[PDB]
Amino acid sequence: GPKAQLMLRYPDGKREQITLPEQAKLLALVKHVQSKGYPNERFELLTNFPRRKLSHLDYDITMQEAGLCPQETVFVQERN
Secondary structure (H helix, E strand, C coil): CCEEEEEEECCCCCEEEEEEECCCEHHHHHHHHHHCCCCCCCEEEEECCCCEEHHHCCCCCEHHHHCCCCEEEEEEEECC
């Protein structure tokens, strides 16, 4: 069925592609980025287009509830 095909763009220039089911919760993505060395307390996720600050959303909602598109580019940014 429907998926969130994600391009992750880390700020050192590393890139990673993952796919999550549309019913996966945002937390899954947050935790994945955390395991890659980018803890939520210091980093936040921003989608390119549409532009969304995912840290402004509750992590317990699903990709579909968050309104993500079938394909997204997610920038990992240091919080400000």
